[PDB]
């Protein structure tokens with residue numbers, strides 16, 4: 013049910029799209045959230061996904077952290093996808109604006125290999141501070157399952173494709 017994507021490799025596809033809009037249209041099995049270790053969904057992809065769930069994602073997430081404690085940078089957890097997807101895979105990429113090791117980006121993308129197909133943003137891009145061109149290269153060289161990347165900014169989408 014994914015439409016309008018450019019095929020980059022055997023298993024990686026890309027589109028200039030808002031991941032919230034894409035999730036509402038497709039209702040994929042798995043939508044990836046660009047999470048932090050506390051699952052505090054304030055801004056970027058996380059704030060936008062949570063707002064689309066009317067804060068139900070944040071209520072679930074606070075219960076998960078109260079039981080389990082914080083995630084690791086490079087780690088993930090599977091929670092409900094609410095009205096957007098069957099499941100949400102909350103993945104923590106390194107936040108360069110907090111000095112986290114960029115080598116943890118490969119560990120973050122490895123989480124995707126546990127799911128046959130996913131709708132995802134570029135990890136560690138945007139407010140997480142990493143170079144999005146580097147993030148796409150790590151995605152292509154790490155993920156083996158079918159990944160549909162939604163890139164919000166058109167200028168960044170055109171740069172990612174032209175330099176691929």
Ligand SMILES: O=C(O)C[C@H](NC(=O)c1ncnc2[nH]ccc12)c1ccncc1
Pocket residue numbers: 029030031032056057060133134137138139162163164165168
């Ligand atoms: O995809 C990018 O362009 C990087 C980053 N992306 C996201 O924050 C992002 N990516 C995909 N769907 C989204 N919905 C809401 C946010 C969101 C960015 C968004 C805007 N301005 C700057 C960066």
